Amino acid sequence: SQTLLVHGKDAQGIIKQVLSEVYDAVTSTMGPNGQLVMIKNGVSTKTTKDGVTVARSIRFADEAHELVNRVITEPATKTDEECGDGTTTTIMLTHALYHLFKDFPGFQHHRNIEDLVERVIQRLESMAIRVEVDDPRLYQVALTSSNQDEKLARLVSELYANNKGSYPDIELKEGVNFEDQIEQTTGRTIRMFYANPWFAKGHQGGVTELTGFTAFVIDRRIDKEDTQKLIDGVNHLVKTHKQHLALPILLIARSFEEAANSTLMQLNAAHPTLVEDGRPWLIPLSTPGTSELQDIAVMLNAPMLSDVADLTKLDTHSINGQHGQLELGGNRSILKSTTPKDEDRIEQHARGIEELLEGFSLSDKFSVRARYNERRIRTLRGKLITISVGGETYSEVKERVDRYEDVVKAIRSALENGILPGGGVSLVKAVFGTIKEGLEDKDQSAEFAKRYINSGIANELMRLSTIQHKLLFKDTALYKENGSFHFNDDWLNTPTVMNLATGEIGTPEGLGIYDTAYASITALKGGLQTAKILATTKTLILGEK
Amino acid sequence: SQTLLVHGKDAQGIIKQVLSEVYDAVTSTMGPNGQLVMIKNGVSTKTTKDGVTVARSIRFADEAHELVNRVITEPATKTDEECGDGTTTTIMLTHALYHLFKDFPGFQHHRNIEDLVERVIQRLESMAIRVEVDDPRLYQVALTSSNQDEKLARLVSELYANNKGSYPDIELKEGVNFEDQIEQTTGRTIRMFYANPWFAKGHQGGVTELTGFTAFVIDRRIDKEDTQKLIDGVNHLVKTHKQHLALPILLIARSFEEAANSTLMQLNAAHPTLVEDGRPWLIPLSTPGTSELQDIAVMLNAPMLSDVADLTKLDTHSINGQHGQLELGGNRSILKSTTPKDEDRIEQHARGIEELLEGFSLSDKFSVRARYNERRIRTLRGKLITISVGGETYSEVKERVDRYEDVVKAIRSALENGILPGGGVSLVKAVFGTIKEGLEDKDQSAEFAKRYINSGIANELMRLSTIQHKLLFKDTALYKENGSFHFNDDWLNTPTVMNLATGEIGTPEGLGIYDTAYASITALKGGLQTAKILATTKTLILGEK
Amino acid sequence: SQTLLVHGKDAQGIIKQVLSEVYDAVTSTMGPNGQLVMIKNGVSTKTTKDGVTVARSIRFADEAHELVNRVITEPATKTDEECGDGTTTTIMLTHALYHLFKDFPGFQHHRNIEDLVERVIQRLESMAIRVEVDDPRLYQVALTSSNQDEKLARLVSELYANNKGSYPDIELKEGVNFEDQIEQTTGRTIRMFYANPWFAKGHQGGVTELTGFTAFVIDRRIDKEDTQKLIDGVNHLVKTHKQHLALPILLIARSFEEAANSTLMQLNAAHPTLVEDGRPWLIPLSTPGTSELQDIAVMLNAPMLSDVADLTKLDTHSINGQHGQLELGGNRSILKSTTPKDEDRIEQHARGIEELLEGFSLSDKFSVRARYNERRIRTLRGKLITISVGGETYSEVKERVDRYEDVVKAIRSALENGILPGGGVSLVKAVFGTIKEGLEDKDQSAEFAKRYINSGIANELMRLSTIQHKLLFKDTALYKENGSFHFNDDWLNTPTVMNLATGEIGTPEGLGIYDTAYASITALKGGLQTAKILATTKTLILGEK
Amino acid sequence: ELMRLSTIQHKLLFKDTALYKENGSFHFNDDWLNTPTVMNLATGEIGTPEGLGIYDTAYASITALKGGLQTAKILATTKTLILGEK
Ligand SMILES: Nc1ncnc2c1ncn2[C@@H]1O[C@H](COP(=O)(O)OP(=O)(O)O)[C@@H](O)[C@H]1O
Ligand SMILES: Nc1ncnc2c1ncn2[C@@H]1O[C@H](COP(=O)(O)OP(=O)(O)O)[C@@H](O)[C@H]1O
Ligand SMILES: Nc1ncnc2c1ncn2[C@@H]1O[C@H](COP(=O)(O)OP(=O)(O)O)[C@@H](O)[C@H]1O
């Protein structure tokens, strides 16, 4: 609290500092041969090689430093929370490109840098591999991410390879035994749950199992302003349309606030003739993206309704009571018995969503838009698997659950978005490609040389792609011969790396080292903006207002 | 005097420091637009832009620093003491290549660097231009080095252009008038002078003028061990061979020490019959490279003699007394009247030396061997010119003499070794050439890529050639447009620079900016070794034994 | 002795500092109303308003500061040593233009500044007034420079006004009485004096008076190498040409060294027949600019001779013995009796020098070339006046001598180079003129605006001319009315100032305040270069080698 | 003095760009006053503000100057600072 206002020379000196510190800390941990960090938390010691853990938990003393650290860290942290891998890499690059931006100042050059990298990005996007569940490489992918588990990879790759035609959704529970236990099902998890514990079996948040129902999907959030539209709705269907109705009447909506939940408790007490074994004939169901409720509507033959007052204006055309089988829960509800008349309607609805993705742009196929729409498909079609993980102690079971979850996250994103060749190669080929493409095309080579090659950027960026490769393999067998390394054309055609586990030398394709497409893309994408930011900042404020 | 022994991390940290300081100090002064230094010497202020002065006179506080400074400085200082220009440049490069050596460690790489640069050196050696006295560019050369004197350049270029067929030797004296004064002669200066003041006219180191003599050239250094060989020699010629002898008998040798000079004073007193007007008939003559006395022998019809005892065994075949005209002096002797019978013998002797240079290697044509042999030619053939420089005060005459001496040094080395295109261009072309030559030749491109291009050196060395060009023109008209500069093929073909005097833009060939070949070669040559040294040193000792 | 090497930010910060200090010290002293400085010298106190004294004697503590001070000071000091006035002014401006150079950086702008000021300089050179001895303003000039002496001005202006047709040369001696005493003569001082005290009357450096002689002017410096050419010369004239010869034979030359003076002492002893009353018949005469001896030659009918050996080859055509009257002295020789046959030859020689000045350029008319040639004219033609200054004490006589010498220096340069209008006006008109001239001329106004007006320099330079006027009159009657001052066209036509002595307000032409042309020119000229230097310096060295 | 001050905004925006590189600094001649040339910082091209599409609301740059004045004055004419909590 000397000065709360930092301008200029100073600010960047600090940014440089911090960035350099973090880099050292985290990059040390990269790969299987990476060295370890010890972390205090009160009275204990986590000792790790998880860059993300390291990164998340690195702290500093001066407010200034921290201020900047946060900016380096949160983006790396933000990769694993959606992708599942690739923070270190992000950081490494964040250093890489920063340094770069600093070598070529002037607010035309920064513009030029961006475009170049952006084109490189697209080259990565194109280089994307694809994999079906049958393929053997899913093993090798699962093997990489499981830090060399000969047991897990085998199991999980069989899971996906045996169900050829359905994508298995997988859950995890902490088991009791030394052995694992697998529970395969043919139903799908639904995101709906009780609004109030009273509406369940036994009137206290239990698990009500049903063999008949009539669902109705409302969109609006429900509170004290809807209590009247509900009384008009409920008594209109129970009086007029009671003939064609299997109990219970499920009222699925966005949110049920407590003023409307107490109204529907008394509407259950209003008709005690329709109470069978304690089960209330009306259950309100909330959900945590409007079209996710449209999926809930399609699975259960329920119509979609915008307003609560629309419950009145209905007919045998719009009311459809199902005689399947449903298991409601406080956490989530589960469907099981699906008559093949329904499986035609859900499969038709899923084809409608798939056709929307078929005519997406290639860049939008890695957006959140597409990834949510595929999260819809797998709710609609797929097989629920419950694995109960075990082991010799308590902590080793809990750790083994995490190692499984890593595996699933890897495998899903593997077949979903393909895979690139490992050992920091893919990036090198991409850069050297992108340079060669624009320089080779006679049309624009005019300006291309002038912007990138002539100014010297191209050459700088080429050396930067190398970094990952340098970090992994500096001080090994590969790099010993010939002083440093010779990234010639011969190498570009057949890139040679070292498997750090084994010790042998070969192609990443040969040896079985692959990174998820989505990671090393997001890494670079993320790397750029965050680099830029640090580079173009000229001021730090620490003043609590 | 904390520690007298510096090893490692420290030593180089220091070397870096110093080198960086010096560079800043000196490079600031480069070109006509360079900024100024003020220097104390006791109670005064020299304010300058002379890099050499700056360099020579920069001091430091810690013994350590100085230790290193000396090593940077003395080589730069050593360029002007033989070439006459090019210290700054040397230093700039000394930084340049240092920095380089540091980027590529490993004692194969340093080897590779050397070879590359060496090849570049040869490319400079080849790029060498040539100039005859008639050519207009000698003006433009003289104009550059005279810091834009429209008067001096004109005069001195006329001097060399009017005597087409003889290379004028030029001396300088501090004059009396506001105007200069020129004294043209047709004689040649000889490096011989009195051993003792007694042997002159008036017996006190005066200027004896003669119209007849008989010279004898001895090789050995003469002291107390030769006093007897002289008495046997002198009386053998004065008794036996007095008929065919014109006085005085000149005894030219290397050194006459005082034990032999007093012997020949009494040998003059021994025959007082041969004393005409006070003039002693015997004069010993010393000279400050054995074959320089062979030139003295050829000009004067004197024979060459290895020993002092050889003076006895002589005949009319070996004794030849000249009837020309000679002016002996305490500083130097001067010849004037040369009978066309002698001018055939000297011209034949000069052709013998020229033929030795005709079949020299191109690299040996810039050695000391060739340069001394051409210093022989110009003693033998050429016209002595005495210029007496004047002006309005005392200090401005003395300064004007120096400016003239700069001009002569420039012009001589200009026609002697040619000239390269200025503005730090020549170096750029050479590098880009040398890279393109070896990479283009299909024979060895195999290894060439592997050593220089692939490792990245080539690219580093290319950026380094630029430095001179960057320093001169950064922050001007030329460099404003397009952020920085674009050293494309188009530029290599027609290199554009800025004349800092005028402001206009064009080729160095067009605008009239030329550097002596010998300088920018010696600069680079010197740059390399001295760079290496600083780079490869790992220890500093300060201990007075 | 912390650091002996100062680069950059620092160096200029220091230069700024010093310059600012000096300025304050000296500028405080400008004009009659200026405040006083007290100076220590050991054990006393000089208290003054003499800027030059102040300037010369200001000292500093850090070597650095001093280093720079010297550079500011010596040029100011150098004005009074040739002009006699105008140091403060110089300094003021040295600040002024410095400051300016700093506002417009970039090494085109500095070039532009120079040219502008240079044109301004020429406008001053043109504005030059002229004055004949008769004119009343010489009084007013003499009055200004004599710090308001109603007695001195009157006397000295009468001296020059009474001798209308001859420019009086004036000397000064410290008198005995309370009253002054004037000694008018019709002879001219000559710069020749005894080489040795032996050659005088009484043989001990006395004042030999003569009524007949035969002079001979030699050019060369005479030493041990001329002793023989003298014995051949002297005995050739005393033997062959003794008939047409009046004694003594005066041998006027540049320098007589002691080896030749002892030769001519014995040549006087060689012919004792020609010794009359002790007077040696041969006197060597030395002089401290070759053509000053040509003046000595023309006054005395002596021929000019280049060599000492030329004394032999002479005839009645070349030897001419005068029967005038001469008074030789150890300090200087004096001529008196001049036959009207001689006064035709000297007056013809003086017309020859005047005609060389008639066709000089206007810029070269203020050079050293012209000023030395006029120092020749006044040696040749003019009246010697010896004033013996007195007063009540010792120190007040010595001070009164200095006040007289100021007066003469002023008056001579007044009629010699004219006079400009005072109170720092002339400079203002010049600037405002030079701006208006180039801007008004339709031919080049194109570029003129672009260089000077458009960039803003012109306006800056205008405000700077004001400074002198501001310093003199800020905090007075003139500047009280209207906040500050309004340099309108009306003012430019009729410039109003304040006489600081009286208090009244009027034109400098009206009130009688005039500066010598040569001063305020040299001030500005000097101001510029020295300003530039300080501005363009980027380095300070303090290291004793 | 006031003329040089109007420039400031223009100087700040475009110092160290394409426009200001040529001719040392800038030449606010009559020719410029008639057809004022600026640089669009988004694109990089050079032209009139009318041509390129760069416009400020009237109310702002008025209130700016209006506000600028009084607040300038105040700071300039103040000669005293009190910090004493009563
Ligand atoms: N067994 C292996 N052999 C060779 N390279 C490997 C191996 N395992 C990982 N790599 C390489 O090292 C990197 C793994 O680092 P990791 O710390 O898991 O990355 P992040 O924490 O950023 O997800 C990947 O870029 C991969 O190409
Ligand atoms: N008038 C000019 N115009 C353009 N370039 C010049 C001019 N004069 C010199 N140069 C360039 O600048 C350098 C001169 O620096 P200088 O200090 O004289 O070198 P050094 O002290 O090393 O001899 C040369 O390399 C030359 O090419
Ligand atoms: N009596 C006076 N009235 C008005 N102005 C004067 C008077 N005397 C001198 N000045 C002005 O003041 C300056 C005299 O300063 P001075 O210290 O004598 O100059 P310097 O020391 O540079 O010769 C001159 O420029 C002159 O114009």
Short mmCIF file of C-alpha atoms in Angstrom, two decimals, chain C residues 54-333:
data_model
loop_
_atom_site.label_atom_id
_atom_site.label_comp_id
_atom_site.label_asym_id
_atom_site.label_seq_id
_atom_site.Cartn_x
_atom_site.Cartn_y
_atom_site.Cartn_z
CA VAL C 54 31.66 38.00 -12.58
CA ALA C 55 31.64 35.47 -15.41
CA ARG C 56 35.39 34.95 -15.53
CA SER C 57 35.48 34.40 -11.75
CA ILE C 58 32.37 32.27 -11.09
CA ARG C 59 33.49 28.87 -9.87
CA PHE C 60 31.87 25.53 -9.04
CA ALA C 61 32.41 22.40 -6.94
CA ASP C 62 31.79 19.21 -9.12
CA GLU C 63 34.21 18.71 -11.99
CA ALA C 64 31.18 18.01 -14.21
CA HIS C 65 29.56 21.42 -13.68
CA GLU C 66 32.81 23.26 -14.23
CA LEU C 67 33.50 21.27 -17.32
CA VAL C 68 30.31 22.79 -18.72
CA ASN C 69 30.75 26.22 -17.20
CA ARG C 70 34.06 26.72 -19.00
CA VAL C 71 32.18 26.18 -22.27
CA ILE C 72 29.62 28.91 -21.42
CA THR C 73 32.18 31.34 -20.06
CA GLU C 74 35.22 31.38 -22.40
CA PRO C 75 33.17 32.66 -25.35
CA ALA C 76 31.79 35.55 -23.28
CA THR C 77 35.30 36.24 -21.96
CA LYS C 78 36.49 36.07 -25.64
CA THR C 79 34.18 38.97 -26.71
CA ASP C 80 35.76 41.62 -24.44
CA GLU C 81 39.29 40.58 -25.31
CA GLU C 82 38.69 41.80 -28.94
CA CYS C 83 35.55 43.97 -28.94
CA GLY C 84 35.66 45.51 -25.42
CA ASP C 85 32.00 45.02 -24.36
CA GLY C 86 29.11 42.51 -24.59
CA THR C 87 29.58 39.37 -22.47
CA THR C 88 26.39 39.40 -20.41
CA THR C 89 24.30 39.82 -23.45
CA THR C 90 26.14 36.87 -25.02
CA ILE C 91 25.22 34.74 -22.04
CA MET C 92 21.66 35.84 -21.87
CA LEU C 93 21.24 34.77 -25.44
CA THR C 94 23.22 31.56 -24.86
CA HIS C 95 20.36 30.70 -22.51
CA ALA C 96 17.74 32.06 -24.86
CA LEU C 97 18.61 30.03 -27.96
CA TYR C 98 19.45 26.92 -25.94
CA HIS C 99 16.06 26.80 -24.50
CA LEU C 100 14.81 27.29 -28.08
CA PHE C 101 16.82 24.46 -29.63
CA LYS C 102 15.30 22.26 -26.94
CA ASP C 103 11.72 23.06 -27.93
CA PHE C 104 12.19 21.92 -31.49
CA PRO C 105 14.12 18.68 -31.58
CA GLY C 106 14.90 16.63 -34.73
CA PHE C 107 17.95 17.21 -36.83
CA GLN C 108 16.18 18.98 -39.54
CA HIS C 109 14.74 21.57 -37.13
CA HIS C 110 18.17 22.51 -35.69
CA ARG C 111 19.26 23.09 -39.29
CA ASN C 112 16.22 25.34 -39.79
CA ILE C 113 16.83 27.29 -36.63
CA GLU C 114 20.41 28.06 -37.69
CA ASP C 115 19.46 29.45 -41.10
CA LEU C 116 16.78 31.65 -39.65
CA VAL C 117 19.06 33.16 -37.04
CA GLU C 118 21.78 33.49 -39.67
CA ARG C 119 19.45 35.67 -41.79
CA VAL C 120 18.63 37.68 -38.70
CA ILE C 121 22.37 38.12 -38.23
CA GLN C 122 22.65 39.60 -41.74
CA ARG C 123 19.82 41.98 -40.96
CA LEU C 124 21.85 43.28 -38.00
CA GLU C 125 24.88 43.59 -40.23
CA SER C 126 22.78 45.74 -42.60
CA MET C 127 21.17 47.86 -39.84
CA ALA C 128 24.69 49.11 -39.05
CA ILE C 129 24.91 52.93 -38.53
CA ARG C 130 27.94 55.06 -39.43
CA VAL C 131 29.60 57.96 -37.69
CA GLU C 132 32.30 60.51 -38.56
CA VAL C 133 34.46 62.05 -35.77
CA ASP C 134 32.60 65.44 -36.11
CA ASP C 135 29.16 63.98 -35.24
CA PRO C 136 27.74 64.69 -31.67
CA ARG C 137 26.66 61.06 -31.02
CA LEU C 138 30.30 59.99 -30.36
CA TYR C 139 29.90 61.97 -27.14
CA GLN C 140 26.72 60.03 -26.31
CA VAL C 141 28.48 56.76 -27.14
CA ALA C 142 31.46 57.77 -24.98
CA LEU C 143 29.00 58.89 -22.30
CA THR C 144 27.24 55.44 -22.21
CA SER C 145 30.41 53.36 -21.97
CA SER C 146 32.00 55.71 -19.41
CA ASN C 147 29.08 54.94 -16.99
CA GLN C 148 27.98 58.63 -17.08
CA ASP C 149 31.27 60.67 -16.96
CA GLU C 150 30.51 64.24 -18.01
CA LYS C 151 34.28 65.03 -17.93
CA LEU C 152 35.91 62.10 -19.90
CA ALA C 153 33.49 61.78 -22.78
CA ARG C 154 33.94 65.57 -23.40
CA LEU C 155 37.74 65.30 -23.52
CA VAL C 156 38.08 62.14 -25.62
CA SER C 157 35.38 63.23 -28.18
CA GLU C 158 37.22 66.55 -28.59
CA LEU C 159 40.46 64.63 -29.20
CA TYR C 160 38.90 62.79 -32.16
CA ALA C 161 36.81 65.85 -33.29
CA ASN C 162 39.79 68.28 -33.41
CA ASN C 163 42.04 66.01 -35.51
CA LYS C 164 39.47 65.81 -38.40
CA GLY C 165 41.57 64.06 -41.08
CA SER C 166 43.79 61.87 -38.83
CA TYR C 167 42.76 59.02 -36.51
CA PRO C 168 44.49 59.51 -33.15
CA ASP C 169 46.25 56.50 -31.62
CA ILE C 170 46.04 56.86 -27.80
CA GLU C 171 48.26 55.49 -25.01
CA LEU C 172 47.81 55.67 -21.21
CA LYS C 173 50.26 56.21 -18.32
CA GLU C 174 49.57 56.37 -14.52
CA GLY C 175 50.14 60.00 -13.58
CA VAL C 176 51.37 61.88 -10.51
CA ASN C 177 48.99 64.88 -10.24
CA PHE C 178 45.28 65.28 -9.37
CA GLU C 179 44.87 66.66 -12.94
CA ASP C 180 45.36 64.85 -16.27
CA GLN C 181 48.02 65.75 -18.80
CA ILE C 182 47.96 65.47 -22.59
CA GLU C 183 50.94 64.99 -24.93
CA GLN C 184 50.17 65.34 -28.67
CA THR C 185 52.75 64.18 -31.26
CA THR C 186 52.90 63.91 -35.13
CA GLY C 187 54.90 60.61 -35.28
CA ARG C 188 53.79 56.97 -35.41
CA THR C 189 54.65 54.03 -33.16
CA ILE C 190 56.53 51.14 -34.78
CA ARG C 191 56.50 47.57 -33.39
CA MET C 192 60.31 47.02 -33.67
CA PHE C 193 62.64 46.65 -30.63
CA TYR C 194 66.24 45.62 -29.66
CA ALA C 195 67.19 41.94 -30.03
CA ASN C 196 69.92 42.34 -27.34
CA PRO C 197 70.50 45.19 -24.74
CA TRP C 198 74.15 45.56 -25.97
CA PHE C 199 73.15 47.31 -29.27
CA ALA C 200 71.69 50.41 -27.53
CA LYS C 201 73.36 53.67 -26.38
CA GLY C 202 75.54 53.00 -23.31
CA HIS C 203 75.51 49.27 -24.25
CA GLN C 204 72.67 48.46 -21.74
CA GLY C 205 69.16 48.63 -23.30
CA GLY C 206 68.88 52.45 -23.23
CA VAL C 207 66.94 54.71 -25.62
CA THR C 208 69.20 55.50 -28.63
CA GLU C 209 68.14 58.62 -30.54
CA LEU C 210 69.28 58.95 -34.16
CA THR C 211 69.20 61.55 -36.98
CA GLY C 212 70.28 59.20 -39.80
CA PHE C 213 70.15 55.46 -40.60
CA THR C 214 69.96 52.80 -43.37
CA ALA C 215 67.30 50.11 -42.65
CA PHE C 216 67.09 46.57 -44.17
CA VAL C 217 64.07 44.34 -43.64
CA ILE C 218 64.68 40.56 -43.48
CA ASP C 219 61.74 38.07 -43.21
CA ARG C 220 63.33 34.81 -41.90
CA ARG C 221 63.83 33.85 -38.23
CA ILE C 222 67.56 34.08 -37.50
CA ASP C 223 69.63 31.55 -35.46
CA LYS C 224 72.97 29.55 -35.70
CA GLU C 225 72.29 28.64 -39.39
CA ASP C 226 72.49 32.34 -40.49
CA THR C 227 75.81 33.46 -38.82
CA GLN C 228 77.72 33.00 -42.13
CA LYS C 229 75.12 34.78 -44.38
CA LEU C 230 75.37 37.78 -41.99
CA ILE C 231 79.25 38.02 -42.14
CA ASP C 232 79.02 37.85 -46.00
CA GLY C 233 76.21 40.45 -45.96
CA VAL C 234 77.60 43.03 -43.45
CA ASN C 235 81.16 43.14 -44.89
CA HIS C 236 79.78 43.32 -48.47
CA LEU C 237 77.95 46.61 -47.70
CA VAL C 238 80.61 48.15 -45.40
CA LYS C 239 83.39 47.42 -47.95
CA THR C 240 81.69 47.87 -51.38
CA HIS C 241 78.77 50.26 -50.65
CA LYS C 242 80.16 52.46 -47.80
CA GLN C 243 79.98 55.70 -49.87
CA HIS C 244 76.14 55.87 -50.03
CA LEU C 245 75.43 54.85 -46.37
CA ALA C 246 74.32 56.73 -43.23
CA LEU C 247 75.02 54.89 -39.94
CA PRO C 248 73.61 52.95 -38.23
CA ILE C 249 72.74 49.95 -40.43
CA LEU C 250 69.48 48.66 -38.94
CA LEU C 251 68.76 44.96 -39.56
CA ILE C 252 65.02 44.53 -38.93
CA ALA C 253 63.86 40.89 -38.86
CA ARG C 254 61.31 38.50 -37.27
CA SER C 255 63.43 37.01 -34.45
CA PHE C 256 67.12 37.26 -33.56
CA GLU C 257 68.17 34.19 -31.51
CA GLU C 258 71.37 34.43 -29.37
CA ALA C 259 73.78 32.59 -31.77
CA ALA C 260 73.36 35.40 -34.38
CA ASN C 261 73.26 38.35 -31.90
CA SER C 262 76.78 37.41 -30.63
CA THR C 263 78.02 37.21 -34.29
CA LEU C 264 76.88 40.85 -34.95
CA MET C 265 78.51 42.07 -31.64
CA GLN C 266 81.90 40.97 -33.07
CA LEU C 267 81.09 42.39 -36.54
CA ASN C 268 80.68 45.76 -34.66
CA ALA C 269 84.11 45.14 -33.07
CA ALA C 270 85.47 44.24 -36.58
CA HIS C 271 85.19 47.85 -37.88
CA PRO C 272 85.93 50.22 -34.90
CA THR C 273 86.51 53.12 -37.41
CA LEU C 274 82.70 53.52 -37.81
CA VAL C 275 81.92 53.79 -34.03
CA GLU C 276 80.67 57.32 -33.15
CA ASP C 277 80.07 58.13 -29.39
CA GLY C 278 79.64 54.42 -28.37
CA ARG C 279 76.65 53.88 -30.72
CA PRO C 280 77.13 50.54 -32.52
CA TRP C 281 76.68 50.99 -36.28
CA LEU C 282 74.63 47.74 -36.52
CA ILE C 283 71.38 47.07 -34.59
CA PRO C 284 69.27 43.85 -34.92
CA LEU C 285 65.55 44.52 -34.42
CA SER C 286 62.85 41.90 -33.68
CA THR C 287 59.01 42.13 -34.02
CA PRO C 288 56.12 39.98 -32.63
CA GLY C 289 50.99 38.68 -40.41
CA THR C 290 54.14 38.89 -42.61
CA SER C 291 52.99 42.21 -44.13
CA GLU C 292 53.49 44.10 -40.81
CA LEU C 293 57.21 44.04 -41.66
CA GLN C 294 56.23 45.42 -45.13
CA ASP C 295 54.84 48.46 -43.26
CA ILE C 296 58.14 48.79 -41.33
CA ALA C 297 59.89 48.60 -44.76
CA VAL C 298 57.73 51.36 -46.38
CA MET C 299 58.13 53.88 -43.50
CA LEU C 300 61.97 53.63 -43.57
CA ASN C 301 62.88 53.27 -47.35
CA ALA C 302 64.29 49.81 -46.55
CA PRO C 303 63.83 47.09 -49.16
CA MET C 304 62.03 43.79 -48.43
CA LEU C 305 64.34 40.69 -48.43
CA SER C 306 63.24 37.02 -48.18
CA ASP C 307 66.66 35.41 -47.39
CA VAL C 308 69.75 36.58 -45.37
CA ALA C 309 72.06 35.72 -48.33
CA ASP C 310 70.23 38.42 -50.43
CA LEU C 311 72.26 41.09 -48.49
CA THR C 312 75.18 40.45 -50.88
CA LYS C 313 73.36 41.04 -54.24
CA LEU C 314 72.56 44.78 -53.80
CA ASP C 315 73.17 48.14 -55.55
CA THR C 316 72.41 51.96 -55.23
CA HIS C 317 69.00 51.02 -56.77
CA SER C 318 68.22 48.77 -53.71
CA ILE C 319 70.16 50.56 -50.83
CA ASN C 320 68.56 53.80 -49.54
CA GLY C 321 69.89 55.50 -46.39
CA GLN C 322 67.47 57.89 -44.66
CA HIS C 323 68.32 61.22 -43.03
CA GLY C 324 65.15 61.58 -40.95
CA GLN C 325 64.97 61.04 -37.14
CA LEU C 326 64.38 57.85 -35.17
CA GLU C 327 64.11 56.87 -31.51
CA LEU C 328 64.87 53.16 -30.87
CA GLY C 329 63.56 51.50 -27.68
CA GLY C 330 63.59 48.22 -25.72
CA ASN C 331 59.76 48.10 -25.86
CA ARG C 332 59.15 49.85 -29.22
CA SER C 333 60.83 52.25 -31.68
#
